[PDB]
Amino acid sequence: XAXVXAXV
Amino acid sequence: XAXVXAXV
DNA sequence: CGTACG
DNA sequence: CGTACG
Ligand SMILES: *C(=O)c1cnc2ccccc2n1
Ligand SMILES: *C(=O)c1cnc2ccccc2n1
Ligand SMILES: *C(=O)c1cnc2ccccc2n1
Ligand SMILES: *C(=O)c1cnc2ccccc2n1
Ligand SMILES: [Mg+2]
Ligand SMILES: [Mg+2]
């Protein structure tokens, strides 16, 4: 759920 | 994440 | 690095 | 009730 590189 | 009634 | 429902 | 990444 975080999007630091993927945002899912 | 489960969709038993919303599916999110 | 943790968000997302009826 | 539990899922979703590079
Ligand atoms: C977001 O909160 C989140 C949490 N755990 C994960 C595991 C696998 C891929 C994506 C994820 N996203
Ligand atoms: C994004 O592409 C990405 C990849 N690996 C990580 C590891 C831990 C924290 C955040 C990350 N973000
Ligand atoms: C799915 O796995 C999941 C987990 N917890 C939640 C909390 C709030 C809304 C949606 C949710 N979805
Ligand atoms: C779906 O609409 C819905 C509503 N509340 C719940 C509570 C517990 C398990 C599954 C649920 N599904
Ligand atoms: Mg985890
Ligand atoms: Mg929970």
| CA A2 centroid distance within chain | 4
Residues 6+ apart with CB under 8 A from B6: none
Q: How distant, in Å, are the alpha carbons of A2, A5, A7, B1, B2 from that of B6?
A: 21, 27, 21, 9, 8
Distance B2 CA to D3 C1' (A): 7
- Cα–Cα distance, B6 to A3 (Å, whole number): 23
Resolution in A: 1.4
Please provide the size of chain B in residues. Answer: 8
Which technique? Answer: X-ray
User: Is B8:B2 a contact under the CB 8 Å cutoff?
Assistant: no
Hits for CB < 7 Å against strand D across B residues 1-8: 1-4, 6, 8
Distance B4 CA to C5 C1' (A): 10
